[PDB]
């Protein structure tokens, strides 16, 4: 239904540039609350789908964007089983586990603390995508060294530094 998406695109593409910018995409997105969708999350979604390095998405790339956001709303709902419109510690544990991450209980606390911009120990839709993208990024860094894929790496000092230089 590219026809629907094209109408969506046009509405979102406010300045009619033919490309959706970060500030245009943000206005179009809801995190379920009355705060603007996390601008860092917005910029990561643009980066993930922009193929032309233009700080924006054209129509074709927006179709990827729409599918990605929609796939995340569905996951966010699947795991928000108590219909708060926020994901909780227990719900996060079910989510990440469902995703195939094996992580200690106290680590889930570090994740909440790092990503919950609301401050109630519950994760909003925009912050949930964000934390999942960081995990994804960090894991890609890791699995470049986890050769026999057993979740242990042995790295030299210089390998470590370049790992971190490509995060921060």
């Amino acid at each position: 239904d590219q026809s629907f998406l094209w109408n969506v695109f046009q509405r979102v593409d406010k300045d009619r540039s033919g490309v959706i910018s970060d500030t245009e995409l943000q206005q179009a997105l809801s995190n379920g609350t009355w705060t603007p969708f996390n601008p860092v999350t917005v910029r990561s979604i643009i980066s993930m789908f922009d193929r032309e390095n233009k700080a924006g998405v054209n129509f074709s790339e927006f179709t990827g964007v729409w599918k990605y956001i929609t796939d995340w709303q569905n996951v966010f709902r699947t795991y928000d089983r108590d219909n708060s419109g926020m994901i909780d510690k227990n719900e996060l544990k079910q989510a990440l586990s469902g995703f195939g991450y094996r992580l200690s209980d106290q680590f889930h606390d570090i994740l909440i603390r790092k990503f919950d911009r609301q401050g109630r120990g519950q994760i909003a839709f925009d912050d949930f995508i964000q934390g999942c993208i960081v995990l994804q990024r960090l894991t890609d860094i890791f699995r470049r060294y986890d050769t026999d894929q057993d979740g242990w790496i042995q790295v030299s000092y210089e390998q470590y530094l370049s790992m971190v230089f490509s995060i921060v």
Binding site: Y68, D71, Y101, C132, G151
Partner: peptide, 15 residues
């Protein structure tokens, strides 16, 4: 296997 997904367990693992 690893303590992390190695196949498309969340959106968009291949993106």
């Amino acid at each position: 296997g690893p303590p992390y997904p190695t196949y498309p367990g969340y959106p968009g693992y291949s993106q």
